[PDB]
Amino acid sequence: MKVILLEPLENLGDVGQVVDVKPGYARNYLLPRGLAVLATESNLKALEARIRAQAKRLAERKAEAERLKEILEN
RNA sequence: AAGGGGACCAGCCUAAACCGUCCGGCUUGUCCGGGCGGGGUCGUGGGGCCCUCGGACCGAAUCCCCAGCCUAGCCGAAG
Ligand SMILES: [Mg+2]
Ligand SMILES: [Mg+2]
Ligand SMILES: [Mg+2]
Ligand SMILES: [Mg+2]
Ligand SMILES: [Mg+2]
Ligand SMILES: [Mg+2]
Ligand SMILES: [Mg+2]
Ligand SMILES: [Mg+2]
Ligand SMILES: [Mg+2]
Ligand SMILES: [Mg+2]
Ligand SMILES: [Mg+2]
Ligand SMILES: [Mg+2]
Ligand SMILES: [Mg+2]
Ligand SMILES: [Mg+2]
Ligand SMILES: [Mg+2]
């Protein structure tokens, strides 16, 4: 049962990682405790749409820095 | 059971793709979901989306009117 970790978890994986666990662990532990959500298609693109923003909104923190590394060093 | 002979005869709407809008959520958006509207309905497969071209007949099982019919009756030959 693939689920999306919402927290860095011991020997399981990092936050945002999609790992496989037994169903009982998912519905009776990981899911009612907020530690993860199930890897449905519905909130699978939710994950792709956040890695997207961060990928863009981080490289923008890089593109603007250069727009001054070129100015000031000159 | 197929097949043959007959009775009757009639075919339709939708889900999904893709658009639009509204509302919700807080994993902030090219986000997810819920509505509603548009789209669409097929087996030679069909539909969606993008290119070129071509630009009125059909018609309900729904509604209206009417005939007809039903719920009383009536005329009716000649000792
Ligand atoms: Mg047979
Ligand atoms: Mg027959
Ligand atoms: Mg919608
Ligand atoms: Mg619809
Ligand atoms: Mg429609
Ligand atoms: Mg249609
Ligand atoms: Mg239609
Ligand atoms: Mg329709
Ligand atoms: Mg048809
Ligand atoms: Mg065939
Ligand atoms: Mg096709
Ligand atoms: Mg008919
Ligand atoms: Mg009909
Ligand atoms: Mg009489
Ligand atoms: Mg008499």
| Rounded distance in angstroms from the CA atom of residue A38 to the C1' atom of nucleotide B9 | 54
What's the reported resolution, in angstroms, to a tenth? 2.3
| Rounded distance in angstroms from the CA atom of residue A14 to the C1' atom of nucleotide B70 | 83
Residue A41 has φ and ψ, to the nearest 5°, of -60, -40
Looking at A1-74, which runs of residues are DSSP E strands? 2-5, 18-20, 36-38
**Buried/exposed A35-71: b ≥16 CB within 10 Å, e otherwise:** bbbbbeeeeeeeeeeeeeeeeeeeeeeeeeeeeeeee
Give the whole-angstrom CA distance, residue A14 versus residue A36: 11
A27 CA distance to ligand 12 centroid (A)?
A: 55
Give the whole-angstrom CA distance, residue A67 versus residue A54: 20
Q: Which nucleotide is nearest to A43 (CA to C1')?
A: B32
Give the whole-angstrom CA distance, residue A57 versus residue A63: 10
Experimental determination approach used: X-ray
Nucleotides of B under 7 A from a protein CB: 27-33
Are A43 and A14 in contact, with CB atoms under 8 Å apart?
no
